[PDB]
Amino acid sequence: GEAPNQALLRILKETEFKKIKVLGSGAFGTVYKGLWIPEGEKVKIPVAIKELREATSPKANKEILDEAYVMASVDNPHVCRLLGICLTSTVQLITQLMPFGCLLDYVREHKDNIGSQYLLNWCVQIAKGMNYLEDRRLVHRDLAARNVLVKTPQHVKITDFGLAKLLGAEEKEYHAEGGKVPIKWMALESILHRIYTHQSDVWSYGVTVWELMTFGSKPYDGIPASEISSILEKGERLPQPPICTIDVYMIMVKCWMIDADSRPKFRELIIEFSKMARDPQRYLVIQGDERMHLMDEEDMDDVVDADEYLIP
Numbered sequence: 672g673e674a675p676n677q678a679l680l681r682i683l684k685e686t687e688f689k690k691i692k693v694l695g696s697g698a699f700g701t702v703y704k705g706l707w708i709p710e711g712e713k714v715k716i717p718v719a720i721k722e723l724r725e726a727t728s729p730k731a732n733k734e735i736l737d738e739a740y741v742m743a744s745v746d747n748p749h750v751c752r753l754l755g756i757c758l759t760s761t762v763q764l765i766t767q768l769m770p771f772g773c774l775l776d777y778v779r780e781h782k783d784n785i786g787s788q789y790l791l792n793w794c795v796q797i798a799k800g801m802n803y804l805e806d807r808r809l810v811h812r813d814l815a816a817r818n819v820l821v822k823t824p825q826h827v828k829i830t831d832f833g834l835a836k837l838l839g840a841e842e843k844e845y846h847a848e849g850g851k852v853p854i855k856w857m858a859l860e861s862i863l864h865r866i867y868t869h870q871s872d873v874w875s876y877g878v879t880v881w882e883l884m885t886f887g888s889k890p891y892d893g894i895p896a897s898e899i900s901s902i903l904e905k906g907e908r909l910p911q912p913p914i915c916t917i918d919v920y921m922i923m924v925k926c927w928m929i930d931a932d933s934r935p936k937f938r939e940l941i942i943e944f945s946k947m948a949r950d951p952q953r954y955l956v957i958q959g960d961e962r963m964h965l966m967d968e969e970d971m972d973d974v975v976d977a978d979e980y981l982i983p
C-alpha cells in the first residue's frame with residue numbers, strides 16, 4: 672500500500688553542457704559550474720555539475736545514484752532539484768546553479784550587511800522546504816547551514832541529500848547503521864539510538880537557525896564530537912545569540928527538547944517565523960539593520976564636518 676514514484680530521471684548528453692570552472696574539490700569528488708544547452712531549444716541554463724574522482728569507486732557510485740533518486744523525487748521552491756544525470760566514466764549529477772553558494776559562508780562574508788529581515792525570511796524558507804520534505808515523507812538527515820544554497824539573497828533552498836531516507840507508509844522512524852553523521856547537528860536520540868525522524872530534523876533546524884543568528888559560528892566551538900552527547904545529557908544547550916530576543920531563542924530552545932513530540936513542527940515554525948518576519952526589528956537587534964554606510968576608520972562620535980564648524 673505505497674504510491675508509485677513516477678518521477679522522471681533525465682539522461683543528458685555530455686555534449687549538451689559546457690563545463691567552465693571548478694567550484695570545489697572536496698573529499699567527495701568535485702563540483703563544477705557550467706552551462707546546459709539543450710540541442711533543440713535556444714536557451715542557456717546555468718548549472719552545477721557534481722561527480723567523483725577520475726577512478727571508479729564501488730560503493731560511491733551507488734551513493735550518487737541514491738542521491739539522484741531523492742533529488743529527482745522532490746519538487747519545491749525551497750528544495751534543490753536534479754535537472755538530470757550524465758553517464759560518463761563516472762556518473763555526474765546536474766542541478767541548477769546557486770550563484771551565491773552555501774548559506775553558512777554567505778552569512779560569514781556578509782555579516783556587516785545582513786539585516787533582520789533577511790535572517791527571518793531564510794528561517795521561513797528553510798522551514799517551508801523542510802515541511803515539504805516531511806509531506807513527501809523524507810527525513811533529511813544532514814540539515815545545516817552548509818547544506819542550504821543561495822539562489823539570491825532573498826531566495827534559498829535545501830540541498831545535499833546524501834543521507835536522506837524515505838520512510839514507509841506505516842514507518843515512523845529510520846534506524847541507521849554506520850558512523851558518518853555530523854554529531855553537532857543531531858538530536859540526542861539520534862546519537863544514543865541511531866533513530867531519525869522528521870522531529871529529529873527539527874533539532875537540526877534549530878542548530879541551523881543558531882548558525883545563522885550568530886553569523887556563521889561553529890556550534891560548541893571548543894568541545895570535540897566525543898563529548899557532545901554528554902554535555903547534551905547534562906541539559907546544556909547552545910547559547911543565546913547576542914542579536915536574539917528571548918522570543919526567537921525560545922524557538923531554538925524548543926527544537927532541542929528531549930521529547931521529540933514536544934518540539935515544534937515545521938508547519939508551526941513557518942507560522943511563527945512568518946509573524947516575526949512582518950516586524951523584524953521587534954525580534955532581532957542588529958546594530959546597523961539596513962547597511963551602515965564616510966568611512967571614519969576611527970572610534971569617534973564627536974566628529975563634525977568642517978562645513979558645520981563655524982567661526983569660534
Ligand SMILES: C#Cc1cccc(Nc2ncnc3cc(OCCOC)c(OCCOC)cc23)c1
Nearest residue numbers: 694695719721764766767768769770771772831
Ligand atoms: C548536483 C549537485 C549538488 C549537490 C550538493 C551541493 C551542490 N552545490 C552547488 N549547487 C549549485 N550551485 C552551487 C554554487 C556554488 O558556488 C559557491 C560560491 O559562491 C560564489 C557552490 O559552492 C561549492 C562549494 O565551494 C564554495 C555549490 C553549488 C550540488
